Amino acid sequence: ATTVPEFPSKLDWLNTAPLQFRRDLKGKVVILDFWTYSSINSMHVLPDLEFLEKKYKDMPFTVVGVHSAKFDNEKDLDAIRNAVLRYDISHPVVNDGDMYMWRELGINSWPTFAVVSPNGKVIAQIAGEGHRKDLDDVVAAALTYYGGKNVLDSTPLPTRLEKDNDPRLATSPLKFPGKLAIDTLNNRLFISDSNHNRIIVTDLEGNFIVQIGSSGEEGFQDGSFEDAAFNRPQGLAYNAKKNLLYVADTENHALREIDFVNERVQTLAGNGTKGSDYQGGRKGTKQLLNSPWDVCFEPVNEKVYIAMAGQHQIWEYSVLDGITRVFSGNGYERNLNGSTPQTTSFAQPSGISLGPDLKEAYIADSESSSIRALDLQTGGSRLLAGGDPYFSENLFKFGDNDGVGAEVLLQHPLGVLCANDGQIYLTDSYNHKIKKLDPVTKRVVTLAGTGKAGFKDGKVKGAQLSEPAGLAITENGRLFVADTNNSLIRYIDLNKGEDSEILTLELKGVQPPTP
Ligand SMILES: [Cl-]
Ligand SMILES: [Cl-]
Ligand code: NA
Ligand code: NA
Ligand code: NA
Ligand code: NA
Ligand code: NA
Numbered sequence: 001a002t003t004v005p006e007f008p009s010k011l012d013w014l015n016t017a018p019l020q021f022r023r024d025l026k027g028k029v030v031i032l033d034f035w036t037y038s039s040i041n042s043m044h045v046l047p048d049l050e051f052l053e054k055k056y057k058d059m060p061f062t063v064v065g066v067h068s069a070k071f072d073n074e075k076d077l078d079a080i081r082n083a084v085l086r087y088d089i090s091h092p093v094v095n096d097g098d099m100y101m102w103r104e105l106g107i108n109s110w111p112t113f114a115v116v117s118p119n120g121k122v123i124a125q126i127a128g129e130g131h132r133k134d135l136d137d138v139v140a141a142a143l144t145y146y147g148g149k150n151v152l153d154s155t156p157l158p159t160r161l162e163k164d165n166d167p168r169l170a171t172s173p174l175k176f177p178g179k180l181a182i183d184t185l186n187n188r189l190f191i192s193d194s195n196h197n198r199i200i201v202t203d204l205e206g207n208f209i210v211q212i213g214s215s216g217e218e219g220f221q222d223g224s225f226e227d228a229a230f231n232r233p234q235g236l237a238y239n240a241k242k243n244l245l246y247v248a249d250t251e252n253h254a255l256r257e258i259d260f261v262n263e264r265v266q267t268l269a270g271n272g273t274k275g276s277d278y279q280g281g282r283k284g285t286k287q288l289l290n291s292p293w294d295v296c297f298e299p300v301n302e303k304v305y306i307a308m309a310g311q312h313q314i315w316e317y318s319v320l321d322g323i324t325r326v327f328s329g330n331g332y333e334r335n336l337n338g339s340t341p342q343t344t345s346f347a348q349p350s351g352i353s354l355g356p357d358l359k360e361a362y363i364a365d366s367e368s369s370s371i372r373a374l375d376l377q378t379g380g381s382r383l384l385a386g387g388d389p390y391f392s393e394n395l396f397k398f399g400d401n402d403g404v405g406a407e408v409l410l411q412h413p414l415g416v417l418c419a420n421d422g423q424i425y426l427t428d429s430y431n432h433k434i435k436k437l438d439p440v441t442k443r444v445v446t447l448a449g450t451g452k453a454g455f456k457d458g459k460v461k462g463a464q465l466s467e468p469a470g471l472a473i474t475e476n477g478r479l480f481v482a483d484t485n486n487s488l489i490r491y492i493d494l495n496k497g498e499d500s501e502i503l504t505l506e507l508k509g510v511q512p513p514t515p
Helices: 041-056 077-086 101-104 133-149 495-500
Strands: 030-034 061-067 111-116 124-128 180-183 188-193 199-204 208-212 236-239 244-249 252-261 264-270 280-283 290-300 305-310 313-316 323-328 349-354 360-365 369-377 381-386 413-416 424-428 434-435 443-448 470-474 479-482 489-491 503-505
Touching: 030 041, 030 101, 030 133, 041 061, 077 180, 111 133, 133 369, 180 236, 180 479, 188 236, 188 479, 244 264, 244 290, 244 305, 252 290, 252 470, 264 323, 305 349, 305 360, 360 381, 360 413, 360 424, 413 470, 424 470, 424 479, 489 495
Parallel strands: 030 061, 180 470, 236 290, 290 349, 349 413
Antiparallel strands: 030 111, 111 124, 180 188, 188 199, 199 208, 236 244, 244 252, 252 264, 280 323, 290 305, 305 313, 313 323, 349 360, 360 369, 369 381, 413 424, 424 434, 434 443, 470 479, 479 489, 489 503
């Protein structure tokens, strides 16, 4: 039986004083969760771990999220810490950024659970999602067994939650805003205040108008604007014709309709449960979704296109008949461009935007680190920038680099926008940059930020962003950014070109959710 290795010293910890197997975990049943915060499957099992953490609240048991990074941005401890906050992780987390623990145990995928005994022997090793009951069973067995031997110690752990270390988390008006939308005719900005579980509506200068989902708790409720609840929502799309806001309500696996004419919120598809349905076609909320991350609206045929980050697909909600179908993507996580939906594949797509023609849709394909164009007529896709165009299986061709074709390198882009002039704006998220893509030339240029996570409101080329993920634009040319880990809405007036500077949009009247 494998004896788990000790954690190396000068491995940083979050949510806790540094732990080790010989001093603090001796006498505990431990689940090692090998994860990385860019993995939607890693995200998919956090609620499994929350289940076990609550079930075994006052038993000698602990989850340790061994964060083994995929992307290079993910080795920075402050990146993981923002993820730990965004994801509501409260168990111990250690940044094993060079995968020492990963390799020593033989971990192959994300996520992968290693269950360790009070003595330090590895008694089970499970990979993949959908193993809540399997883990529930091992931990039960281990507990009632090693408790029979009387080798368990229920001394507390040196718990120091990161969310209890920051005064401003409660204070800031916005908590990790991710996605944006705009109503230029009536001059309104739509903010996905993700980790406040609400939707904030202001004016293009920054002035509060109305708040949808007022209690700020995580929940899943339809009804009035004060009674509604979301769960860390992400993408938004605005229906000018009917004065509606569509919400990709990611952690409820649902599509919500914010109805401003009637001041109510109603659910269009999904039901709070992560589906595993790859064809779809059912009506309204009979149809399950899976981590809808971005949503955009096509007003001619009245179609809502959903970037289904959970299943690597683009889906299509139809306003006329309330049906949600797969639109493109066969289900495998690949950077596979093909003529037909079934011969096409995405990699955790998280951003979707319609071109001015209304005939293509550009996709932030975060896990292949590429921008792609989905053909609305054929359900097929083409590669614009990034990715490994010779290997669809390759999901590790990332970096930071401007240019054309193979010269381009990105890193987990989350956000994409198509201006009415038909140029493409993206947030290279792990590079903390805004970048511009031209669809014809396929040339990508850095437009803002230095590549270094932080905050600074300077002249764009030396200014700073922290993991930006959302975009919206005016015809005047002001480009709003959702600067996520800075919990700020920036903006760039694009007219000024090489003279231009990124600013912060000060919000007037926007207060955090009552506690
Ligand atoms: Cl989340
Ligand atoms: Cl069926
Ligand atoms: Na959106
Ligand atoms: Na429902
Ligand atoms: Na599959
Ligand atoms: Na298919
Ligand atoms: Na089609």
